[PDB]
């Protein structure tokens, strides 16, 4: 049985309905009861049972979480959205021996769109002494998660040379932070004059370019 | 009902690892114990379940060959053995107890299995200096193994605006993370900024000055 | 009107076409006892009553023969025979207002269950306890009427339903209300399937020497067999003789 | 349906008080009339009910002895006589008409009965001067009887940030309260502030100037 | 009949459900109907009938107020609670002749916890010539009401000598205010040097001392 | 008690007053089989059994002769004849807690 988990990326503000919908290839219904189950995983924590069966709630589960559905279609709803609900929600089947979990829905709270603070870090001198160069493009306090970073080395797009690290949603700020590291050899780094970062985001009316010459 | 697992086992490719799950709070002779696999930041794949009272093991088709499940009712401990470890096997394995007609119902913490050919290496820490409102600076930790590295500013004297990005495994098999902070432009002249990095596996405690 | 003062209209001297009733899907319940709705067109009724009122939805089931409940016990009772129909449709939009609709009333308290098709509009203060009321509302003295309190948001059960109960009288007596069912020319000496004003049989219709009085409309011989009938158009008398049957 | 009562009766301990409830908007002859007691800032206690048509009075067990109820259909007026007034009887008594199968249904304003051996007196005002941003000042009115007291600042020209705490009775049986206000410290030396206190029973109108 | 009214002090924000529960020692239902009734009283106004019977609504009662229950337990719910619902709610039984009212529930609109602004005032000189000395401690703009005021005269705790007055909830700020007046004779007041007011409140991680020297 | 372990009490050697059934307002379903609800005050019974339990509302229908469902089939089954009365009332306010 293959479980398809519609929307797996859901951003809803506090106090609003949030629906995660799991559809099964085959009927999970057997012996009359339903065997579709919902798990919650807080970052840094093991998965915890929320809904055993289609509707029955697990131990110590608030009334906010409600599971419904039958046959091949089920849904999990959290109307009184709270700060403690930011987690990863999985749908799982117990009808057949090979237990299959859903893709997983990452539920996060929503806030107003903010523009990214774009910063550029040239590599340190001692790094050039080590024969390596890493140039950093930084996006501070930007929402939503969607963001495009482009490295321009003397007006040339680079591909397969950048690594992006994104922090989780802040507990209070609720705004993301992104870092992009461009790694090159020292000889190759010293061969081009200008290094620029292109940031594309929903909060900007146009892509933002921040550049610096070598030295 | 609480379950206790092993802690963060590392192995070379092709090796085998034995992992222990210690039941607590129930008979351990009335509930089948399940084992599940989870890659970091990925989905869940149910590996297989063992019945403690009668040693009946049933495995997922993918894990039938490389996984062995055993139980010990005398010490109330289940064991999972992974053989022929590869890079695809590095993950966060979970132990679970049967309950409420759900296969995995009561999970226990989580054990990180790391399969790699690399070795314990010390982090290299480089100052990301401010460029010549709010200015930005930081430190970059590159080529360390294994995770994690604790990074702070002025031994925890600065916490506001400190972003410690998660580490990324490079093609070389090592980890790197950038810890950055935004500071007032006026503070560049007088305020001194130092980044403190701690790597317990390499036992390195290193402090670097960052200046414009 | 409210259920306690249910409004009765006496339908008489009309051609009633019930097709519009069961054809329309607006009505929620169309339960007919003693008659089939699809056959309502063919019948002729001695007299028709239409008792209309407004009730709560969950109490619609109480409008039926042999049913008990507050509405049945104290407000509106249907006889066990009840050759008729009950048509109830939801009217939440019409009978619910912003705030509350308190015009409609129902009788909480009555000393005894009211007789079938009885109406009690008396608002005398009911005496629940031992102490006589003497007309003052007190601890055990209550006004017998309670407002439904219809609000725009309510459950299907609590939302108002308008109910119309059509009581038919089906008998050999002269019929006023009839279905359309056209008409046909009369034939005398031939075995036919006559349908005089609802009566149905098979026999020849000879001229009758029998002397009918002006109020008489149909004749029965010994053993109570309909052997004479006055047609409702010509106002003439016809003797019915069943056409020949015999062994072979 | 409107009911009107007497207003603010005060009596020394041991006295008797008669309150009148004037009915309007209905027959007054077909509805029983209930009387309920409410201690200030407390729950409601039902005193007792009377039938106007037949003078059949039924009282609560606690209030059977010290209370009596009469009715006069001639003027459409109900009456209560409280006898042997003591300190515990000081309260806001309410007159209600019976309706909707509820004993007390349609209530009318409320008559305050104050049992106290004290006498009418004038307020004594003392300036709570600001301590030497936003500072605070005010006046304290003490040793006045009875309620109420009217307190204003600069003849109503200072209404933002003013808090007039409810009066509390002291051991002597008199009333005291502090009326305070917060003002920016920039106006401490510039704007003169005066609290106006009006006590009608003593006819005392006092303007007190508060200064640092 | 004794009516016990659970929670009698409820704080709920605008648009949030508020449930006030009334339980009875004996059965209140009789003759097939229910007799428990819910009254509302705004400050400075006589109580008015909201719910006559278990569920029927009184005259001019908005649909927000819903009464439910039977047997020995009843409940009153206000789902879309509005700012004009700050009042006192009573439950009253009509089954037996002595009509009993519940303890009463004070309904207040909820808001975020605010730190108390704590001020002190020595007695006025004119009051000192009168032979009385009242030291006043003020707590301005704090929520909730739970706050302990302790008087320290030369590091000696006083009891039974201070009166605390609490104002009603502000219409706009929705923050309580408290005053604590400590009254002393002139001779007793003038025998000590240091007078302090210690305030304990939820918005404070530690109790705050506001102290002053006489002179 | 729970429906599976339904609690049974024997009523015998006592005079029974059924007014509490007619006076109470809580009772939602008052269905009698083989006897009439109003005539229980004029009948003599050799022995009475008063079973009691808590059920889900949608399952109240299953407490009746000749009925099928989870409760009837596995928890509490009534005989086909069943001269007796079933009285069920809502208890949401009492049997529901926070959580
Ligand atoms: C009845 O009405 C029809 C149609 O107008 C008419 O032809 C017929 O003559 C009427 N009946 C009598 C007895 O006149």
- Whether the CB of E33 is below 8 Å from some CB of chain C: the reply is yes
Q: What's the gap in Å between C212 CA and the centre of ligand 1?
A: 22
Q: Which residues of C touch D31 (CB under 8 A)?
A: 136-137
Residues 30-69 of F with CB under 8 A from A: none
Q: Could you tell me if E96 and E40 are in contact, meaning their C-beta atoms sit under 8 angstroms apart?
A: no
Subunit contact D103:C137, Cβ cutoff 8 A: no
| Neighbour tally for F40: CB within 10 Å | 16
| Phi, psi at D12, each rounded to 5° | -70, 155
Q: From edge to edge, which strands make up the β-sheet containing C226-230?
A: C204-207, C237-241, C226-230, C218-220
CA-CA distance, E94 to D100, in Å (whole number)? 11
Residues contacting residue B142 through CB under 8 Å, at least 6 positions apart: A134, B123, B124, B125, B126, B174, B176
CA-CA distance, A81 to E100, in Å (whole number)? 41
CA-CA distance, A152 to A155, in Å (whole number)? 5
Which segments of C82-136 does DSSP mark as H helices, in order?
92-95
- Whether the CB of F20 is below 8 Å from some CB of chain A: the reply is no
Q: What's the gap in Å between C50 CA and the centre of ligand 1?
A: 29
Residues contacting residue B124 through CB under 8 Å, at least 6 positions apart: A130, B141, B142, B143, B144
Integer-rounded Cα radius of gyration of chain A: 23
Method: cryo-EM
Bin E151: left if φ > 0, else alpha if -120 < ψ < 50, else beta. Answer: beta
Q: What is the dihedral of CA E49, E53, E59, E63, to 10 degrees?
A: 100
Residues contacting residue A203 through CB under 8 Å, at least 6 positions apart: A113, A114, A115, A116, A142, A143
Q: CB under 8 Å, gap of 24 or more: what pairs does F76-79 form? A: F76/F3, F76/F6, F76/F51
CA-CA distance, A11 to A29, in Å (whole number)? 31
Please state whether the peptide bond connecting residue A144 to the residue before it is cis, i.e. omega within 30 degrees of 0. Answer: yes
CA-CA distance, B194 to B210, in Å (whole number)? 6
- Count helices and strands (H / E) in chain C: 3, 15
Which segments of chain A does DSSP mark as H helices, in order?
125-129, 186-189
Tell me whether chains C and E touch (3+ CB pairs under 8 A). Answer: yes
Among residues A2, A98, A42, which one has the least CA distance to residue B34? Answer: A98
- State both tokens at C59: 């109490």
Q: Which residue has the tokens 């969950």?
A: C58
Which segments of chain F does DSSP mark as H helices, in order?
19-23, 70, 92-95
- Give the three-state DSSP class for C57: helix
Nearest-CA residue of chain A relative to B164?
A167
Q: Which residue has the tokens 């759900």?
A: B102
CA-CA distance, A200 to A197, in Å (whole number)? 10
Among residues B206, B74, B94, which one has the least CA distance to residue B151? Answer: B206
| Phi, psi at A83, each rounded to 5° | -65, -30
Give Cα separations from D100 to A198, E36, E52 (angstroms).
74, 11, 6
Subunit contact D102:E123, Cβ cutoff 8 A: no
Q: Could you tell me if A95 and A35 are in contact, meaning their C-beta atoms sit under 8 angstroms apart?
A: yes
- Count helices and strands (H / E) in chain A: 2, 18
Resolution (A): 3.2
Q: Which of E33, E66, E92 to mutate to test the interface with C (most CBs of C within 10 A)?
A: E33
Q: Which residues of E touch D176 (CB under 8 A)?
A: 163, 181
Q: Using CB atoms within 10 A of its CB, is residue C130 exposed (0-12), middle (13-18) or buried (19+)? A: exposed
CB nearest to E97's CB, from C139, C147, C149: C139
Which sign, positive or negative, has the C-alpha torsion C9, C11, C16, C18?
positive
Q: Using CB atoms within 10 A of its CB, is residue B211 exposed (0-12), middle (13-18) or buried (19+)? A: exposed
- State both tokens at D63: 């209030």
CA-CA distance, E6 to E23, in Å (whole number)? 8
Q: Could you tell me if C105 and C89 are in contact, meaning their C-beta atoms sit under 8 angstroms apart?
A: no
CA B103 to chain centre: 25
CA-CA distance, A9 to A11, in Å (whole number)? 7
Q: Could you tell me if D127 and D141 are in contact, meaning their C-beta atoms sit under 8 angstroms apart?
A: no
DSSP lists the bridge partners of residue E176 as E142
How, if at all, do strands B102-115 and B9-11 pair?
Answer: parallel
Which segments of chain B does DSSP mark as H helices, in order?
187-190
DSSP lists the bridge partners of residue B58 as B49
| Phi, psi at E205, each rounded to 5° | -70, -25
Secondary element (H or E) of residue C20: helix C19-23
- State both tokens at D59: 């009282």
Reported as half-sphere exposure (CB side, CA atoms, 13 A), residue D106 has a value of 20
Nearest-CA residue of chain B relative to A105?
B43
- State both tokens at D211: 């200064």
CA-CA distance, C189 to C209, in Å (whole number)? 15
CA-CA distance, E78 to E87, in Å (whole number)? 13
Residues 178-197 of D with CB under 8 A from E: 178, 180, 182
Nearest CA distance, A62 vs chain F (angstrom): 6
Which sign, positive or negative, has the C-alpha torsion B2, B8, B13, B14?
negative
Q: Could you tell me if E176 and E167 are in contact, meaning their C-beta atoms sit under 8 angstroms apart?
A: yes
CA-CA distance, D104 to A143, in Å (whole number)? 59
Subunit contact E71:F89, Cβ cutoff 8 A: yes
Give Cα separations from F78 to A21, B82, F51, F74 (angstroms).
40, 56, 11, 11
CA-CA distance, E115 to A148, in Å (whole number)? 43
């Amino acid at each position: 049985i293959v479980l398809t988990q519609s929307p797996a990326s859901l951003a809803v503000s506090l106090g609003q309905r949030a629906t995660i919908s799991c559809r099964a290839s085959e009927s999970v219904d057997n012996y009359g009861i339903s065997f579709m189950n919902w798990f919650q995983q807080t970052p840094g924590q093991p998965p915890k049972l929320l809904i055993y069966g289609s509707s029955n709630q697990g131990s110590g589960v608030p009334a906010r979480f409600s599971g419904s559905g039958s046959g091949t279609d089920f849904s999990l709803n959290i109307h009184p959205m709270e700060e403690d609900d930011t987690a990863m929600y999985f749908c799982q089947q117990s009808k057949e021996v090979p237990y299959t979990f859903g893709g997983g829905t990452k539920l996060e709270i929503k806030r107003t769109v903010a523009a990214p603070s774009v910063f550029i870090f040239p590599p340190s001198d001692e790094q050039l002494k080590s024969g390596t160069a890493s140039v950093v493009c930084l996006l501070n306090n930007f929402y939503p998660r969607e963001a495009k970073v482009q490295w321009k080395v003397d007006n040339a797009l680079q591909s397969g040379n950048s690594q992006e690290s994104v922090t989780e949603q802040d507990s209070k700020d609720s705004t993301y932070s992104l870092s992009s590291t461009l790694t090159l050899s020292k000889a190759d780094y010293e061969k081009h004059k200008v290094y620029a970062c292109e940031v594309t985001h929903q909060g900007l009316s146009s892509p933002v370019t921040k550049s610096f010459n070598r030295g | 009902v609480q379950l206790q697992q092993s802690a963060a086992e590392l192995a070379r490719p092709g090796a085998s690892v034995k992992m222990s799950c210690k039941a607590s709070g129930y008979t351990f002779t009335s509930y089948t114990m399940h084992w599940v696999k989870q890659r970091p930041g990925q989905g869940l794949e149910w590996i297989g379940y063992i019945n403690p009272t009668s040693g009946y093991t049933e495995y997922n088709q993918n894990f039938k060959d490389k996984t062995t499940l055993t139980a010990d009712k005398s010490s109330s401990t289940a064991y999972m053995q992974l053989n022929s470890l590869t890079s695809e096997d590095s993950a966060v394995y979970y132990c679970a107890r049967e309950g409420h007609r759900v296969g995995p119902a009561y999970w226990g913490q989580g054990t990180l299995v790391t399969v790699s050919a690399a070795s314990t290496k010390g982090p290299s820490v480089f100052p990301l200096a401010p460029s010549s409102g709010t200015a930005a600076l930081g430190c970059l930790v590159k080529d360390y193994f294994p995770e994690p590295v604790t990074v702070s500013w002025n031994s925890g004297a600065l916490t506001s605006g400190v972003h410690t990005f998660p580490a990324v495994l490079q093609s070389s098999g090592l980890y790197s993370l950038s810890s950055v902070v935004t500071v007032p432009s006026s503070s560049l002249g007088t305020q001194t900024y130092i980044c403190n990095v701690n790597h317990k596996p390499s036992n390195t405690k290193v402090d670097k000055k960052v200046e414009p | 009107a409210s259920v306690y003062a249910w409004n009765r209209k006496r339908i008489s001297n009309c051609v009633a076409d019930y097709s519009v009733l069961y054809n329309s899907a607006s009505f929620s319940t169309f339960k007919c006892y003693g008659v089939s709705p699809t056959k309502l067109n063919d019948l002729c009724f001695t007299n028709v009553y239409a008792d209309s009122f407004v009730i709560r939805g969950d109490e619609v089931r109480q409008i039926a023969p042999g049913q008990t409940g507050k509405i049945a016990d104290y407000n509106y009772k249907l006889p066990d025979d009840f050759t008729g129909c009950v048509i109830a449709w939801n009217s939440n939009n019409l009978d619910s207002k912003v705030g509350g609709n308190y015009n409609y009333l129902y009788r909480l308290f009555r000393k005894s269950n009211l007789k079938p098709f009885e109406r009690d509009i008396s608002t005398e203060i009911y005496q629940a306890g031992s102490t006589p009321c003497n007309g003052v509302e007190g601890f055990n003295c209550y006004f017998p009427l309670q407002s439904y309190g219809f609000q725009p948001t309510n459950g299907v059960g609590y939302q108002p339903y308008r109910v119309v109960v059509l009581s038919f009288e089906l008998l050999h007596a002269p019929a006023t209300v009839c279905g359309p069912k056209k008409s046909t020319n009369l034939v005398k000496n031939k075995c036919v399937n006559f349908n005089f004003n609802g009566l149905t049989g098979t026999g020849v219709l000879t001229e009758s020497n029998k002397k009918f009085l002006p109020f008489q409309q149909f004749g029965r011989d010994i053993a109570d067999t309909t052997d004479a009938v006055r047609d409702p158009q010509t106002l003439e008398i016809l003797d019915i003789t069943p056409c020949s049957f015999g062994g072979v």
